[PDB]
Amino acid sequence: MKAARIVLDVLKQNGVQHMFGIPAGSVNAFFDELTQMDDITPVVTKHEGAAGYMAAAYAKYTNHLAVCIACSGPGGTNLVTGAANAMREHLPVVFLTGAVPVSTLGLNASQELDAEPIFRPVTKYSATVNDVANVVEEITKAVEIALSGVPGPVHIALPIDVQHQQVPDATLPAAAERNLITPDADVLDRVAEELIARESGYILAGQGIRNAVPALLELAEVLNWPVVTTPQAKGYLPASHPLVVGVYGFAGHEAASELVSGDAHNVALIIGSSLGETATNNYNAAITQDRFTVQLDFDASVFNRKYAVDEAVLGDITLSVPALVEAVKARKVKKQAPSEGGSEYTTKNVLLALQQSLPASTRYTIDIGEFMSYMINHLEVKESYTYEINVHFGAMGSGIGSAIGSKLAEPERPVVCITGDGCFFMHGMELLTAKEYNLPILFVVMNNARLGMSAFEQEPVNISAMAAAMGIPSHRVSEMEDLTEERVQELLSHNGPAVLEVFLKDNST
Amino acid sequence: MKAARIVLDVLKQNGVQHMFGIPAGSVNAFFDELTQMDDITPVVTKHEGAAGYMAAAYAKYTNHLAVCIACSGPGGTNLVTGAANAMREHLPVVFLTGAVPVSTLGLNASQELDAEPIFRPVTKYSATVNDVANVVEEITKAVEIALSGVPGPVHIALPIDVQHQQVPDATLPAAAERNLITPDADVLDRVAEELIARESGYILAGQGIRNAVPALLELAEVLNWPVVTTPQAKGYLPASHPLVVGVYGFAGHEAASELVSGDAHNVALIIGSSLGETATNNYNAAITQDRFTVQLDFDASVFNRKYAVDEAVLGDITLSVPALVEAVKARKVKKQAPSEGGSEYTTKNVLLALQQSLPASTRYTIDIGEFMSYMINHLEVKESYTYEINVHFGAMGSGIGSAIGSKLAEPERPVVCITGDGCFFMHGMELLTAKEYNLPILFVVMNNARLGMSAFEQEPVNISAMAAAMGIPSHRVSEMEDLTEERVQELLSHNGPAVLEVFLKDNSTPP
Ligand SMILES: Nc1ncnc2c1ncn2[C@@H]1O[C@H](COP(=O)(O)OP(=O)(O)O)[C@@H](O)[C@H]1O
Ligand SMILES: Nc1ncnc2c1ncn2[C@@H]1O[C@H](COP(=O)(O)OP(=O)(O)O)[C@@H](O)[C@H]1O
Numbered sequence A: 001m002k003a004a005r006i007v008l009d010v011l012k013q014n015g016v017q018h019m020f021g022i023p024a025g026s027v028n029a030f031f032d033e034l035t036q037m038d039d040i041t042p043v044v045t046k047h048e049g050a051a052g053y054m055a056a057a058y059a060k061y062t063n064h065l066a067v068c069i070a071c072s073g074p075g076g077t078n079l080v081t082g083a084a085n086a087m088r089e090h091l092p093v094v095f096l097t098g099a100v101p102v103s104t105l106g107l108n109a110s111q112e113l114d115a116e117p118i119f120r121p122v123t124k125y126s127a128t129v130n131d132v133a134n135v136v137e138e139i140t141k142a143v144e145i146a147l148s149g150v151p152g153p154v155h156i157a158l159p160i161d162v163q164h165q166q167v168p169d170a171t172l173p174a175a176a177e178r179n180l181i182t183p184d185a186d187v188l189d190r191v192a193e194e195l196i197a198r199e200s201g202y203i204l205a206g207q208g209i210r211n212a213v214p215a216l217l218e219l220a221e222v223l224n225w226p227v228v229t230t231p232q233a234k235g236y237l238p239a240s241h242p243l244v245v246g247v248y249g250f251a252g253h254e255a256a257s258e259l260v261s262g263d264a265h266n267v268a269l270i271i272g273s274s275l276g277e278t279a280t281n282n283y284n285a286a287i288t289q290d291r292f293t294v295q296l297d298f299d300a301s302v303f304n305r306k307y308a309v310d311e312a313v314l315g316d317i318t319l320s321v322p323a324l325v326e327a328v329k330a331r332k333v334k335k336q337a338p339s340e341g342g343s344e345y346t347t348k349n350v351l352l353a354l355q356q357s358l359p360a361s362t363r364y365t366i367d368i369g370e371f372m373s374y375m376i377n378h379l380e381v382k383e384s385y386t387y388e389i390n391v392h393f394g395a396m397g398s399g400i401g402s403a404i405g406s407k408l409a410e411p412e413r414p415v416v417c418i419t420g421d422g423c424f425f426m427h428g429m430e431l432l433t434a435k436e437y438n439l440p441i442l443f444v445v446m447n448n449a450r451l452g453m454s455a456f457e458q459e460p461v462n463i464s465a466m467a468a469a470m471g472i473p474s475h476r477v478s479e480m481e482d483l484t485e486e487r488v489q490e491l492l493s494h495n496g497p498a499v500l501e502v503f504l505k506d507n508s509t
Numbered sequence B: 001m002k003a004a005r006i007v008l009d010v011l012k013q014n015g016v017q018h019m020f021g022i023p024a025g026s027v028n029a030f031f032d033e034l035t036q037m038d039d040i041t042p043v044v045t046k047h048e049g050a051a052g053y054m055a056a057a058y059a060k061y062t063n064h065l066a067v068c069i070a071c072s073g074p075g076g077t078n079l080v081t082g083a084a085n086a087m088r089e090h091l092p093v094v095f096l097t098g099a100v101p102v103s104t105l106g107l108n109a110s111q112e113l114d115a116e117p118i119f120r121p122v123t124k125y126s127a128t129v130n131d132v133a134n135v136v137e138e139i140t141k142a143v144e145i146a147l148s149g150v151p152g153p154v155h156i157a158l159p160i161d162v163q164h165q166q167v168p169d170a171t172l173p174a175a176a177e178r179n180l181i182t183p184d185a186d187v188l189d190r191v192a193e194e195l196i197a198r199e200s201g202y203i204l205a206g207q208g209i210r211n212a213v214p215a216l217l218e219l220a221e222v223l224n225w226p227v228v229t230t231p232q233a234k235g236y237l238p239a240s241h242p243l244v245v246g247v248y249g250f251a252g253h254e255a256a257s258e259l260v261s262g263d264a265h266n267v268a269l270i271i272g273s274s275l276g277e278t279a280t281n282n283y284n285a286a287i288t289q290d291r292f293t294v295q296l297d298f299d300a301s302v303f304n305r306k307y308a309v310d311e312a313v314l315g316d317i318t319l320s321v322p323a324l325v326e327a328v329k330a331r332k333v334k335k336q337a338p339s340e341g342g343s344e345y346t347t348k349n350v351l352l353a354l355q356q357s358l359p360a361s362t363r364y365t366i367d368i369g370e371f372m373s374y375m376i377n378h379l380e381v382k383e384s385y386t387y388e389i390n391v392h393f394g395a396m397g398s399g400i401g402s403a404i405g406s407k408l409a410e411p412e413r414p415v416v417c418i419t420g421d422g423c424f425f426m427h428g429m430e431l432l433t434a435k436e437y438n439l440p441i442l443f444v445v446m447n448n449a450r451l452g453m454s455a456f457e458q459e460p461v462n463i464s465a466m467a468a469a470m471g472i473p474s475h476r477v478s479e480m481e482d483l484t485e486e487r488v489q490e491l492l493s494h495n496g497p498a499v500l501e502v503f504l505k506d507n508s509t510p511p
């Protein structure tokens, strides 16, 4: 086999059904072999940066591997943003870059650039494979590292000559198993006793609970403790659950900060949050002040970064939370008022009117802009897994990319992307990618003709008109009367992308 | 005297009048200070990747410093492509990134990322400045390094708290002097002796001649030798000059290939070319085989990479070529047929028809796509400085960026950007940037609904209609009759960008 096809066969054997990126000469050994592979679809994007946002979302929502591929040089460096994002999110994305021939590196070959040291700071593993005899050990090694321990992105560079050489030994390795960080059962036995013993506490749930939501809720029930989520984890716990108070942190709820900053709960049970800027209201001491601190995390670096932890529970949440529930069982709230929408033409009232016209199962993918604060603070979490938020790396356009990744990984779930004017100018040509793959996504663009959150203000663009010129259904909302259930429904009914442009210069905070 | 403000004072003192990038929280000390500065215009782009392409072009055509600025995290990483390009092009672009506060790195602050080691492989110098007391030494050093004998991009990351801190000593260094590598006068005199003695030869001119075209042409005249240019240097020597044969290399001319590969010229005088893939027809030996090889370059790494050089002349071309002309003066051809346009609706014929409607002074900024080969092989070089080509790093959308950079640095020169649908979907939103800054640029979009050069083929997009929805004048061409002088002329007469979309599924093979 050609080296390029063995690399795809390893990805296929590991369950990959999509590859995101842009074809070119230095990566068309890959694309010309995907001509004859019914099991893998290349998803051609308009910018490789967006391909990385899609891959991360795809990895997140398939709970497995994702893949990007880009040409040597400019394609590879356009992927660095997507890898930095995936690295911060602990998502297992393989970044495949072309390379110029082994013989001609150093000679200013066309699109020459050694990608290995550029990807090294934003990946768990990075390698340029300069010998066809090492291709299977390197793609195999990259795949196990991406999926093992604390998952993360990896980068493999394949010179174009190597891509076409035959691999000496084509034997395929088995599919990688995720090697989870296993929790110390002795530690869990003691923590359970210490949670009983100290009687009162609260749970701060970050996004690390995302694969153990039923267990996380059962632990709160067994302890009868209230739960607050980080802004990033807003969509993991339904507002209907009697123990779920709301969001603590950036754009968070008054009921949740009154809990955290009061004198009522002895234990701070921190489950799956790195306790960064947006989870802690810029490192406010209230979360753990005058409390006993228990933190559950699989990344050992996170403990005692800023908040001293009395019990650090190293281990994967999908092992330790269900284990903790069994240990607590063997040994033995206020809430946030939902927000009410109104008639005045405000970002708050537009988004709330929007929510009441959409299925309860809708996943909101939220881009980076002022509208993010209203989504986090005002909209209701109707069911679990419904808010794709990034308040970490926060790349503009990652909301657009995550809508496309989510619709590819979980087609049965409806998707609305809440984005903005500036995010549309950066990555809104991907809507053409959504069109080519026939993906039903409603893109709600909040056009305020400024990069908010006179160089900042622009002459307004008719984004609804741009969408129509792209052959994409759209409506422009310029008043509240324009936002009708009939229009929202008629847009979601299309088999492909649609744009609801909300032209709204709201000067509120 | 805040640190972000002293950084702009150093940039202002070094002649910088524009800064390209996208504002955000982590760099808004800079933009909030650019409100108080009449001398510096921020150029807000739609993607920071394109901001780096504009900066590189802006650096090139003002022949001096340029500056990009991006937010910590995703802004900074989006500039990496733009820096890799400036690095390969030896262009003096300063890359400024915000950073999270010094106190909070390691704690997962919002948009936290240490950019220093990411920029290190694609810059001459990279540094995260963690002490306000070290800020003036760091921007000062970055500028001196950017403007080196071998110019290049530099990266300075400034934590957002440092940006707002007062600097301890506000003494400003003088403006950096751009360095020019000095050639050894003994080497130049010996080379001159060997050009006289060996009688015949030819010049291979790369883009390192861009700042010494009149000296370069005089040296050819004094020696009476033919000149071939690299594809990248196509636009530096006019077709009218009797010694200029044409382009050798990617998409090059057969008259130039016949010269290089014939048995006629004793000396291969290579002036300002790294002898990379597109300059040598993928490392073909004809350039120097059985010839006496002399190479002029300011980068000492380029000599003997692949072609053995008998005399390497380290030095800046604007010093050594004029010196060589004086040394040769003291001690003492079949050109490529111009291309003829036709009626057939072909890329070759559309582009030659285009050129017959544009001022001779037009600069073409050429994006990355199949149309590139037709531009290099077929269009006429009417006067010098008119072909912004990239056949090196070759970032899609760098053609779009280079037009905006060119129009800002050299407003009096008309600009036409030859681009494609794939480059339009990548960075076409930058036409909105041209609109905001009232830059008259004609964007010719070669739309074949595929990514040239089932996955490659797309449903066609009406890019002319997209342009009209953006408030941009446009015409769609679907037949040769649609490409009229009146229409090109009406588009070029607009005070802002305009789009001429050439919807053309041409299946001929590119040069
Ligand atoms: N399955 C898991 N088990 C344990 N920890 C996890 C798991 N998945 C993610 N995490 C951890 O959860 C944290 C998520 O924090 P972060 O990404 O900052 O989100 P948030 O904004 O919700 O705090 C990280 O520290 C990561 O190590
Ligand atoms: N003023 C100058 N003096 C000397 N060398 C220069 C000058 N400007 C650019 N160069 C050099 O010329 C070379 C340009 O080669 P390259 O960028 O590959 O263009 P081309 O494709 O025309 O060969 C580089 O080696 C660079 O060092």
Ligand SMILES: Cc1ncc(C[n+]2csc(CCOP(=O)(O)OP(=O)(O)O)c2C)c(N)n1
Pocket (backbone or CB within 6 Å): A022, A023, A024, A025, A048, A071, A074, A075, A078, B368, B369, B370, B371, B394, B395, B396, B419, B420, B421, B422, B423, B424, B446, B447, B448, B450, B451, B452, B453
């Ligand atoms: C950032 C980046 N990604 C990928 C490439 C590879 N590449 C070179 S040409 C090309 C196709 C060109 O597209 P378009 O503008 O449509 O040209 P056309 O199809 O009209 O020839 C691609 C994808 C690149 N140059 N830069």
Ligand SMILES: [Mg+2]
Pocket (backbone or CB within 6 Å): B420, B421, B422, B446, B447, B448, B449, B450, B451, B452
């Ligand atoms: Mg095309």
